[PDB]
DNA sequence: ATATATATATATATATATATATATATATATATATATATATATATATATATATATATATAT
DNA sequence: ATATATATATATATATATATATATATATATATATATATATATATATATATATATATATAT
């Protein structure tokens, strides 16, 4: 339908004036917002304890005293800090939880446009062209069911290794030149980072789902009508199509901790390549090398998260 | 690096003062105008 | 003595998978992973047609840099005589230029880009590609070759 | 051992100061929109110069 | 009958002039919105005093 794109601007239109991330970006003060809630971000591994944030906020800020344009005052940074991080959870954009503050997805989007402006990293690259090449190969083996078609590709890349073992055993391996290797490190670093994005969603849409519950629950004056459709199974009332499945399906890949016993030495190893002290830099090597971990973690908190949520509407639907 | 951490401010200061896409994001009318350009590249890319 | 080990696992792991095919025990994808594994295929490859505007702002910066420097060095002809006798293109703009040109040499080994646009159709052919991509996604998708080549 | 007085554990009442939350009003910056003048661009009529086509005329 | 060099007629292309519409640069005015400042009220925390619950010390 063609008036979807008229529907498309009114979404732009209610995104410019609800959205967190563009709300933001167009302040007067966002610069000084971004540049302070990246620096604070950057080194953590997951969320931050309020009172640790409170004082490198204040570091922060009087690391920005020679900004005095943006009312940084040095009576006391304590105080200022407080009222910073205040101000900014009024806005959505950072959230408290557990006692430690997290970064929402406004922040997160907000965040990867700005550093993304100027100096990101390439896509367009051979890395890229090669891996999607890989991909693209093995989808259509398994999108097909026939069995001759699975049978020759089989065969044929057997032959295929095959030959490049023979030549490997001859001694005609080669290593990656040092602009080649710089470019596949960058490029993996692009595609292992993009993983953890979507983790500060899934607790949105999970929420979404639990407050659209509580909402058709409360809507009907008689609950028992519709508490019979939701309370027949024992399985999780939180059924979350849009992403939760897709997380459980993410979930279904990380539990086999041997590709992640590989990982962990694999991606050591990789940063251990002279080329490695070039191809990234410093913060980005240690992002990448507690990756393993931290997916592990914030997997841990996402799925306490549901649990809570799914065992406080279960203790709803009931006594009602 | 370390001076990174003073760096960056003045950084995004210019860049929300300069750059294309960080202005457009910040006036008025920036909705209409990103609607009507996606509609316009959206069918061909080649030019 | 690594690779030729990592190698001779691989043929041995492609082996048993040979084996289990034979026997018969194929399993597609369903459509709940069919849609995810083609989404995140297009969303991969629509990343190879990001940085093409920005090359061209590179090379064009170098080019103005370059002529700038000319017209200050009012008294040095060994600059420019250095530059002209090299073989190699004026604007070497190596952030951008060196790894676009390493791209383009891979775009240009025909026999990948054929079954990569074979492939393409085939997987948009399938009927649960319909719903994994709208229209638009679809098309631009199946075009990814044409366009890459055109750019 | 008796009789008096005081002390310890806990909470509530009252006061002091700090700090935050809320609302309003203001100044400021800025975006933006309009208006003016100017320059620029296109169309038409006519005069001017160039170039080509056709024909004549010399030499073979 | 063909080439080869003038001459004449015609058409084309260009230059000049004017009328009309549009674009650009600059300046100004206006409105809106943002951000800030100011004022007020309330909340929280601490301190001090008194009241309630419970036990012990001092003097004879």
Same mark, same amino acid.
């Given at each position: 339908?063609?008036?979807?794109?008229?529907?498309?601007?009114?979404?732009?239109?209610?995104?410019?004036?609800?959205?967190?991330?563009?709300?933001?970006?167009?302040?007067?003060?966002?610069?000084?917002?971004?540049?302070?809630?990246?620096?604070?971000?950057?080194?953590?591994?997951?969320?931050?304890?309020?009172?640790?944030?409170?004082?490198?906020?204040?570091?922060?800020?009087?690391?920005?005293?020679?900004?005095?344009?943006?009312?940084?005052?040095?009576?006391?940074?304590?105080?200022?800090?407080?009222?910073?991080? $205040?101000?900014?959870?009024?806005?959505?954009?950072?959230?408290?939880?557990?006692?430690?503050?997290?970064?929402?997805?406004?922040?997160?989007?907000?965040?990867?446009?700005?550093?993304?402006?100027?100096?990101?990293?390439? *896509?367009?690259?051979?890395?890229?062209?090669? *891996?999607?090449?890989?991909?693209?190969?093995?989808?259509?083996?398994?999108?097909?069911?026939?069995?001759?078609? $699975?049978?020759?590709?089989?065969?044929?890349?057997?032959?295929?290794?095959?030959?490049?073992?023979?030549?490997?055993?001859?001694?005609?391996?080669?290593?990656?030149?040092?602009?080649?290797?710089?470019?596949?490190?960058?490029?993996?670093?692009?595609?292992?980072?993009?993983?953890?994005?979507?983790?500060?969603?899934?607790?949105?849409?999970? $929420?979404?789902?639990?407050?659209?519950?509580?909402?058709?629950?409360?809507?009907?004056?008689?609950?028992?009508?519709?508490?019979?459709?939701?309370?027949?199974?024992?399985?999780?009332?939180?059924?979350?199509?849009?992403?939760?499945?897709?997380?459980?399906?993410?979930?279904?890949?990380?539990?086999?901790?041997?590709?992640?016993?590989?990982?962990?030495?694999?991606?050591?190893?990789?940063?251990?390549?002279?080329?490695?002290?070039?191809?990234?830099? $410093?913060?980005?090597?240690?992002?990448?090398?507690?990756?393993?971990?931290?997916?592990?973690?914030?997997?841990?908190?996402?799925?306490?998260?549901?649990?809570?949520?799914?065992?406080?509407?279960?203790?709803?639907?009931?006594?009602?």
């Amino acid at each position: 339908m063609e008036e979807n794109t008229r529907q498309r601007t009114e979404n732009y239109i209610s995104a410019k004036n609800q959205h967190p991330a563009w709300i933001l970006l167009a302040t007067r003060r966002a610069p000084l917002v971004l540049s302070c809630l990246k620096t604070l971000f950057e080194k953590s591994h997951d969320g931050i304890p309020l009172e640790e944030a409170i004082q490198s906020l204040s570091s922060i800020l009087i690391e920005h005293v020679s900004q005095e344009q943006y009312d940084i005052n040095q009576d006391n940074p304590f105080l200022q800090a407080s009222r910073e991080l $205040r101000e900014w959870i009024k806005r959505r954009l950072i959230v408290e939880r557990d006692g430690r503050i997290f970064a929402t997805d406004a922040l997160e989007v907000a965040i990867t446009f700005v550093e993304s402006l100027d100096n990101r990293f390439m *896509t367009s690259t051979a890395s890229r062209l090669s *891996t999607v090449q890989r991909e693209i190969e093995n989808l259509e083996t398994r999108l097909n069911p026939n069995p001759a078609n $699975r049978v020759a590709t089989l065969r044929r890349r057997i032959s295929e290794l095959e030959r490049e073992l023979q030549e490997a055993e001859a001694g005609h391996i080669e290593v990656l030149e040092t602009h080649q290797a710089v470019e596949h490190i960058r490029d993996v670093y692009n595609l292992a980072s993009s993983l953890r994005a979507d983790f500060r969603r899934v607790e949105d849409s999970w $929420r979404e789902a639990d407050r659209a519950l509580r909402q058709s629950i409360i809507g009907e004056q008689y609950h028992r009508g519709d508490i019979v459709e939701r309370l027949l199974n024992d399985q999780d009332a939180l059924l979350n199509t849009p992403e939760g499945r897709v997380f459980d399906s993410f979930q279904q890949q990380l539990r086999q901790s041997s590709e992640l016993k590989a990982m962990s030495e694999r991606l050591r190893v990789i940063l251990s390549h002279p080329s490695a002290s070039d191809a990234l830099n $410093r913060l980005q090597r240690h992002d990448l090398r507690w990756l393993v971990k931290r997916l592990v973690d914030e997997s841990q908190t996402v799925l306490q998260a549901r649990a809570r949520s799914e065992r406080d509407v279960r203790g709803f639907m009931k006594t009602g």
